[PDB]
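The freezer alarm interrupted the setup, so I double-checked each line after restarting. Inputs confirmed:
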Amino acid sequence: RRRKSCQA
Amino acid sequence: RRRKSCQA
Amino acid sequence: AMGSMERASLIQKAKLAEQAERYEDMAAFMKGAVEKGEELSNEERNLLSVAYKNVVGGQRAAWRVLSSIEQKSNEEGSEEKGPEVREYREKVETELQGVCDTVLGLLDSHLIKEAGDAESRVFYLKMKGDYYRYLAEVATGDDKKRIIDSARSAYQEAMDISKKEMPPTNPIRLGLALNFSVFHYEIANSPEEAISLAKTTFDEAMADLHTLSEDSYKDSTLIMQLLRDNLTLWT
Amino acid sequence: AMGSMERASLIQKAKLAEQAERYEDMAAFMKGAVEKGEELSNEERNLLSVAYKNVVGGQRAAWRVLSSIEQKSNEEGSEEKGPEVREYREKVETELQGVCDTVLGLLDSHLIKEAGDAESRVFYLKMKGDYYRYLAEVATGDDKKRIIDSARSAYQEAMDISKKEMPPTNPIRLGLALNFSVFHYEIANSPEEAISLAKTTFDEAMADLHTLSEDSYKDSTLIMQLLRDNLTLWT
Ligand SMILES: [Cl-]
Ligand SMILES: [Cl-]
Ligand SMILES: [Mg+2]
Ligand SMILES: [Mg+2]
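Predicted 3D structure, all chains:
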């Protein structure tokens, strides 16, 4: 799992 | 379904 | 090259480019639109962000693939394959840095200084933090600390405005907190700060959901789930 | 711009670009490698094809999205939105045609004329047919018939060599027949010819599978399944 950053 | 052509 | 095209036509073509998944074209159209010198509406700001996030996202993913290959090639026992891996990683890195510098240049000339409403100012300051963060991801030299501090400073100003002027469920506020938390975890070597920010942001949003319509609730909870995803990964 | 880079370094970087899903870079590296003037090995031919098929594949998909929007905009009752959809479709079309012309130029100067073994010659002639077929997909003017005939002629020469010099299970032969069948169905308005070619190719391959190792059987049956997929769609 890669950490989430905000959607484009 | 889209018809198949050869893989890249 | 976009100077001869009407602003409205650039916006129209950015939307077409998005539909066609032509994000480099989309970003070029939106850069042209910004350079007309008028402020951007909410929809136009979102188009600008979609375009450049997709462009830099592809570059960052490619950079990570190449950096991993390069790191493996410098392990004990690895065969010398010459300069090519480093050279190509550097090529992609330089292109990525160029895109970041382009976005930062649009923000500095002159999107941020003209942005007075909280929704626009926070949006642009978050963008500034994000593109400095992408620069920090590849930085290794004597300015790394200053790049990191530039990201921190932009995020901090955006947080300060967002806390004063926006409700805790505002999607821009939530996405800013999400990304600043990632900055803390991954860039600033501050996992506890990252976890505290994500948790406080989530909890304060939860307590404000009751004020929202169904559509706003959907918008806010989608981003809250990203905060939860990170908390689950990190704890 | 690749003239100063060693051939082996271009090949190495093409493989890295493939791993990073940087297909425009991959194609530029392989164009540089071709322009060194030496013949290509089997692996190098495959790299060339992977690179350009991915580049043009993205352009073709984008072109189809834009062409559909344009067609809907010219239906009765549609609002006039100005020239932008046509202009942007034309921009993507021109870029696609440029990539096709680049590939066709590499084949003509001088890959085909130096290719004497069946596996290389058939591979390049199939490529020539393919890139003329992509030109035909967007052609609307007075040379459309000649573009179509150029695709047909290249495919036909490749078929003639492949039938004389390769077994019916050879993956290049199979992929050539697959694509020539698509040409017949979609470009030449000859669905019966397309179906007959796909069926005969499949059946003649089936009868030769017994001669193959497990690994060759896997290679051949994968492409046979694509022929079956088209037959199921078309009948
Ligand atoms: Cl390079
Ligand atoms: Cl255009
Ligand atoms: Mg407010
Ligand atoms: Mg033979």
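Quick read of the result. The radius of gyration of chain B is 7 Å.
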